[PDB]
Amino acid sequence: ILEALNVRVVGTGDRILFLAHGFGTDQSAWHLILPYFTQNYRVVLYDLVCAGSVNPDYFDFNRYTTLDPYVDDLLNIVDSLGIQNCAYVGHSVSAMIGIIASIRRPELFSKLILIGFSPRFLNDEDYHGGFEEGEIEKVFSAMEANYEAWVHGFAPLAVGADVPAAVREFSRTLFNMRPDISLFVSRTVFNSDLRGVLGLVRVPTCVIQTAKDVSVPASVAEYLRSHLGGDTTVETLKTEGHLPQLSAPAQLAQFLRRALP
């Protein structure tokens, strides 16, 4: 599973940093914000199986039916690298994963920093998710429809801010993803939820909040801080974009170090 999801390591030190990209994107996304840390920690970064920059033949439509296996792999990697003390930085998808894992190994996690993280992408009765059965299927709709067309309209939103580069870079990864893959990964996330499970997280987390996320309501940035218990401070980025890792790495960089370790 090592070369499978092309893992890689940079920098040096007693400190072991980790970077897990999320939906669409791939590890390359961290690039624009990696040098800012490589000279202090030992950064690790892989590429989810769904990723486009990864052999699709490793993606099993009978496996990744939910969010569990995706958390297995993550740990499977950690073991093959034999690690006990590190820092996880998960965004969007990989944000949840860190959460799930963060409980299955409250040991292998010192400071859980989450980016554009969310519990349930589907809004419940007394829960505001920002997307309901309609809102989602509408998207799933054109999605299986004209992928080549769907992406053209999504990128601009997630990124949002006027950054033609940090918005174009997202399409790249978004294309390398065999639609089927994306198609699936979507429904799973949206069909996934880990509310209650949150309180269980012991590791002192750290949620990220942007000016306006196209997929994560604002309120939510507070609901998290609500059911965590572990020393979890939810900071905010004075900028725009769903994926700051690229939209404006400048600030994210600096602001990241203010937590980890």
Side-chain angles (χ1 to χ4, degrees):
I1 198 65
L2 287 159
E3 171 57 288
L5 315 164
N6 38 309
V7 282
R8 220 161 301 178
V9 179
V10 296
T12 52
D14 289 358
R15 267 78 76 154
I16 307 83
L17 175 53
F18 208 108
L19 293 185
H21 75 75
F23 182 59
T25 77
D26 69 353
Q27 70 171 55
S28 73
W30 297 104
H31 276 187
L32 274 294
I33 198 172
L34 179 61
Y36 270 79
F37 293 68
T38 189
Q39 324 294 174
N40 277 291
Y41 305 79
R42 303 230 70 182
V43 189
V44 192
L45 56 149
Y46 71 99
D47 288 300
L48 265 306
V49 45
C50 53
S53 63
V54 175
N55 185 185
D57 265 299
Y58 289 159
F59 183 77
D60 199 66
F61 296 92
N62 295 51
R63 176 171 166 77
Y64 303 85
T65 80
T66 73
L67 199 63
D68 288 294
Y70 287 88
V71 184
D72 279 322
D73 301 339
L74 189 151
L75 287 186
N76 194 43
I77 291 189
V78 180
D79 278 330
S80 49
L81 277 58
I83 334 174
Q84 297 208 324
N85 288 56
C86 59
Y88 187 73
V89 183
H91 150 65
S92 181
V93 189
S94 221
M96 316 173 278
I97 311 169
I99 304 305
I100 292 172
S102 175
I103 307 182
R104 297 167 69 185
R105 292 262 198 176
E107 55 261 16
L108 278 41
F109 289 105
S110 73
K111 173 68 172 176
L112 268 284
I113 303 90
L114 292 163
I115 294 178
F117 169 60
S118 171
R120 193 160 192 159
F121 260 165
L122 199 173
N123 31 55
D124 273 50
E125 191 184 71
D126 305 64
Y127 170 65
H128 183 196
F131 303 106
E132 58 177 55
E133 292 188 302
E135 262 279 53
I136 59 97
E137 201 202 11
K138 187 175 63 179
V139 189
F140 279 103
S141 188
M143 197 174 75
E144 73 148 349
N146 195 184
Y147 197 89
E148 201 132 355
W150 169 62
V151 191
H152 198 272
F154 179 63
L157 266 178
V159 187
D162 259 356
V163 190
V167 67
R168 203 271 167 178
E169 172 56 49
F170 183 50
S171 304
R172 186 234 90 185
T173 75
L174 223 299
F175 279 111
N176 277 295
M177 287 184 72
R178 299 233 269 183
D180 302 358
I181 291 186
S182 166
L183 176 60
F184 209 141
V185 185
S186 316
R187 217 279 203 269
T188 46
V189 176
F190 282 151
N191 235 64
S192 71
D193 166 37
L194 47 150
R195 252 95 65 58
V197 203
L198 291 178
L200 298 167
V201 174
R202 288 85 143 180
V203 192
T205 337
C206 215
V207 183
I208 233 64
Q209 192 175 184
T210 63
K212 184 212 295 173
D213 190 88
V214 69
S215 183
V216 177
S219 64
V220 191
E222 213 312 85
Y223 181 26
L224 304 170
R225 179 169 174 58
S226 299
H227 298 70
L228 279 169
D231 187 89
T232 311
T233 55
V234 189
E235 186 70 50
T236 58
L237 275 178
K238 308 191 289 73
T239 180
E240 223 307 272
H242 175 64
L243 305 85
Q245 34 266 183
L246 279 166
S247 311
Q251 37 197 317
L252 173 58
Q254 299 291 176
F255 276 57
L256 261 157
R257 51 163 49 82
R258 290 178 55 182
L260 42 99

